[PDB]
Structure formats: structure tokens, C-alpha cells
Amino acid sequence: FLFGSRSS
Amino acid sequence: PEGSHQYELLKHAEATLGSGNLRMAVMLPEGEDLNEWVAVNTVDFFNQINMLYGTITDFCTEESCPVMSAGPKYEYHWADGPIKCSAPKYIDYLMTWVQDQLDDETLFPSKIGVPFPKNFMSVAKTILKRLFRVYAHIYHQHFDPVIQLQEEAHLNTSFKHFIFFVQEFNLIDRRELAPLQELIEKL
Amino acid sequence: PEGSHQYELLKHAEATLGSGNLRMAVMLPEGEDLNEWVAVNTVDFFNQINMLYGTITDFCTEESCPVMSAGPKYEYHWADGPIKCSAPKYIDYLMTWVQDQLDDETLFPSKIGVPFPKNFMSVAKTILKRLFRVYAHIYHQHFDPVIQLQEEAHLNTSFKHFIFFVQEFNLIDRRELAPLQELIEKL
Amino acid sequence: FLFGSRSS
Ligand SMILES: [Cl-]
Ligand SMILES: [Cl-]
Ligand SMILES: [Zn+2]
Ligand SMILES: [Zn+2]
Numbered sequence: 175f176l177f178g179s180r181s182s
Numbered sequence: 183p184e185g186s187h188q189y190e191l192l193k194h195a196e197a198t199l200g201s202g203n204l205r206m207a208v209m210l211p212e213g214e215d216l217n218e219w220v221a222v223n224t225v226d227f228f229n230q231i232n233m234l235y236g237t238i239t240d241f242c243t244e245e246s247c248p249v250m251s252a253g254p255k256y257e258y259h260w261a262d263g264p265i266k267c268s269a270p271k272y273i274d275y276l277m278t279w280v281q282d283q284l285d286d287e288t289l290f291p292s293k294i295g296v297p298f299p300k301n302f303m304s305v306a307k308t309i310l311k312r313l314f315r316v317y318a319h320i321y322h323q324h325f326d327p328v329i330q331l332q333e334e335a336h337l338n339t340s341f342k343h344f345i346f347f348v349q350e351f352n353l354i355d356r357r358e359l360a361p362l363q364e365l366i367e368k369l
Numbered sequence: 370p371e372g373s374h375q376y377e378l379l380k381h382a383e384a385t386l387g388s389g390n391l392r393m394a395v396m397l398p399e400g401e402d403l404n405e406w407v408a409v410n411t412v413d414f415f416n417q418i419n420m421l422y423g424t425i426t427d428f429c430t431e432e433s434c435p436v437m438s439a440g441p442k443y444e445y446h447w448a449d450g451p452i453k454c455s456a457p458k459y460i461d462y463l464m465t466w467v468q469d470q471l472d473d474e475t476l477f478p479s480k481i482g483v484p485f486p487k488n489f490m491s492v493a494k495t496i497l498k499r500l501f502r503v504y505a506h507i508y509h510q511h512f513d514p515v516i517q518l519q520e521e522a523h524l525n526t527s528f529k530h531f532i533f534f535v536q537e538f539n540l541i542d543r544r545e546l547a548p549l550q551e552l553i554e555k556l
Numbered sequence: 557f558l559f560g561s562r563s564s
Contacts, residue, residue, distance in 0.1 A: 176260045176275055178312065180252075190420040193523075197417060200526040202389015212519055230384060233377040332399055336380075339387040439562075447558045462558055499560065 186294045191222045204346040216351075217298040220306050221290055223347055228280055228309070230340045231316050234333065235273065238320065241327040244268045250315075252361035253322035258315060269319055276312050283309060303353075310344075310353045317341050318361045342369055373481045378409045391533040403538075404485040407493050408477055410534055415467055415496070417527045418503050421520065422460065425507065428514040431455045437502075439548035440509035445502060456506055463499050470496060490540075497531075497540045504528050505548045529556055 183189035198207040210219050247269035250258040260267055260275055284290050289305055320328065320337065328334050345366055348354045359366060370376035385394040397406050434456035437445040446453055447462055471477050476492055507524065515521050532553060535541045546553060
């Protein structure tokens with residue numbers, strides 16, 4: 175299980 | 183897939199794209215189980231992007247792609263509650279995670295008579311959101327390997343299929359699609 | 370199909386039909402083994418017409434179709450070395466025969482490094498000639514079950530794919546296509 | 557192995 179984030 | 187109706191549904195979905203009207207081809211055939219239709223297409227989008235990423239994986243290395251990028255503006259991270267991954271490390275976690283879901287009998291029952299779980303549309307969304315990123319990283323970072331290998335139409339046509347599909351059944355939000363909304367709108 | 374390049378070639382072929390330009394989608398990708406490309410598409414046309422015939426097989430019975438018909442003008446027979454069989458008997462022989470070929474390691478090697486036999490284009494032709502007839506019998510004799518089941522676009526788009534494919538690589542002669550040359554030229 | 561014929 176992965177918790178994914180994105181950044182700008 | 184045992185010559186089952188579910189297998190027919192996959193063949194049905196693939197054949198009907200040849201009309202080139204993807205917007206109609208991706209709709210629920212009348213009287214069909216929604217979950218089943220989404221399931222079948224989710225599985226096929228996975229195999230598709232898997233083979234797609236597979237064609238350029240020699241160009242995607244720890245060196246070439248130190249971070250998980252979608253162009254300069256956009257960068258992804260995994261965590262367990264920030265483990266930074268190279269793109270091929272990130273994508274390995276993503277696809278392994280996705281495979282694992284598809285291999286979970288509680289989520290994608292291999293038995294055609296077993297109903298999908300109550301939250302199935304939710305797991306399908308999460309999967310498809312994540313599969314988007316592999317498309318995004320290919321476009322923004324390896325479109326030239328893709329050109330020289332001549333798997334550009336394959337990538338383009340697979341991605342067009344994916345978008346129309348996912349917009350039809352509300353499987354991906356607008357924020358997720360942002361690193362490719364240029365390419366999208368072009369359609 | 371093991372995540373092999375051959376499996377990729379199948380996904381490649383299916384995705385690229387979504388452009389709807391079947392005439393280009395069916396051409397040999399540059400540098401690709403001809404035999405392999407034909408093999409992959411032959412196998413998929415078999416699964417396709419198999420699932421297709423499968424949707425209306427309750428409507429195809431010993432009583433409904435006493436002979437192997439392609440409309441009034443055209444009628445097929447099997448013989449060994451003249452055995453009128455009912456359409457479902459004829460089609461069972463045909464598809465079993467075709468399956469058997471695809472299951473023959475000497476003809477369709479399951480091992481990606483093994484060259485196809487010298488006469489491979491010849492066996493592919495014979496198969497595709499025969500697969501035509503199942504399309505022909507469906508159109509001329511069960512198009513109404515097909516309509517009510519809503520597998521008409523599936524049938525039409527599969528058949529359009531098949532024709533363009535087979536014309537591209539010279540796999541079926543003009544005489545064989547005659548019981549459907551109306552529908553054909555229509556697209 | 558089948559030998560196939562057609563008529564009209
Ligand atoms: Cl995520
Ligand atoms: Cl024959
Ligand atoms: Zn990369
Ligand atoms: Zn019949």
C-alpha cells in the first residue's frame with residue numbers, strides 16, 4: 175500500500 | 183477468462199474500437215454489469231500500459247530518471263505515512279501494487295458468478311489514477327525512444343482509449359489529468 | 370505469450386485500431402517478422418469469431434440450419450479424402466480444425482525463438498479462408514439474433530478488421546469473399 | 557483434416 179503525492 | 187462471457191466482453195471492447203468512435207465504443211453495453219465492464223477494461227489498460235512501458239524500459243534507468251517526473255512542473259512521491267524513488271523504482275511499486283489488486287480474488291474475483299466488492303469502483307479509480315502516471319512519464323520523458331521504436335501510435339491510441347474510458351465512468355479526477363491536459367484537449 | 374514481444378505485438382495491433390484507420394493499423398510494423406505479425410492476428414481473429422459465434426449459438430441449431438449456408442446462393446460442404454453437415458456441425462469441424470492448427474507447435478511455435486514453418490503463410494491462408502465462412506453464416510443467417518443481442522458493432526467492426534487485414538497480406542482469394550462482397554465494398 | 561467445397 176502506497177500513499178502517493180504530487181508536487182508542482 | 184474461460185470462454186466466459188467476461189472474456190467475450192474483453193473481445194467486445196477491443197473489436198468495437200476499430201470504428202474509431204471511442205466515445206461510443208467505451209459505453210456500457212445495455213444490461214451489462216457496470217463493475218464487470220470496468221473490471222475488464224481496467225485489466226486491459228494495465229496489460230497495455232505494462233507492455234507499453236516495457237518497450238522503453240531500457241531508456242528508463244536510475245540515471246536517466248532520478249526522480250518520478252511528469253515534466254518539470256510535476257513530480258510524484260511515494261510514502262508509507264517521503265521515500266523518494268527514481269522513476270523506474272516508483273513505477274515498479276505502482277505496477278506491482280496494481281497487479282496485486284488484479285490478483286486479489288476479493289477485489290477482482292476470478293469466478294464469474296461472484297459479485298465484485300462493495301467498494302469496487304473505488305479501487306478501480308485508484309488503479310486508473312495511478313496508471314495515468316505511467317502514461318504521463320512516458321510522454322514527458324521518453325517520447326523520443328517511443329518515436330524511434332514506432333510505438334507512438336500504439337501509445338497515442340492506447341492513451342486516447344484510456345481517457346475516453348475513464349471520463350465516461352468518472353474514474354479519474356481533473357487534478358490527476360493535469361500533467362497532460364494539453365495532449366488530452368488536443369482530442 | 371509471457372510478457373514476450375509477441376504478446377506486445379498483439380496489444381500493439383489491438384490498440385492501434387482505435388484510430389479507426391484500419392488500412393494503416395494492419396500493416397507490418399517496420400522490421401517486424403511477417404509470419405509473427407500474421408500469426409498474432411490469426412490467433413486473435415480466431416478468438417474473436419469464436420466468441421462472436423458463441424453469442425448466437427443458441428440460435429444456430431440442427432433444426433434452424435440443416436445445411437451450411439451463406440444465404441441461398443452459397444452452400445458449403447466437408448468431405449474426407451460428400452458429408453452435408455448442419456451449419457453447427459460444419460462450424461464445429463472448422464473451428465476444431467483451426468484450434469488444432471493453433472495448438473500445433475510445428476505450425477504456431479509456442480516458443481518465441483523458434484522460426485515458423487516454411488509453409489506458414491499457406492496454413493494461415495487456409496485458416497483465414499475458413500474463418501470467413503463463420504462470418505458469412507452469421508451475417509446471412511443470424512443477423513437478427515445479433516441485432517437483439519447488440520453484438521452488431523462487435524461483429525461489424527471485427528469483420529472490417531478481418532477484411533482489411535486479410536487483403537493487406539493476401540490471405541484470402543476473391544472467390545472466397547463472394548458471399549459477402551456486398552457488405553465488403555460497403556466499407 | 558477437412559476438404560472443403562462450396563456451391564451455388
Ligand atoms: Cl496515489
Ligand atoms: Cl476448405
Ligand atoms: Zn523514465
Ligand atoms: Zn446457423
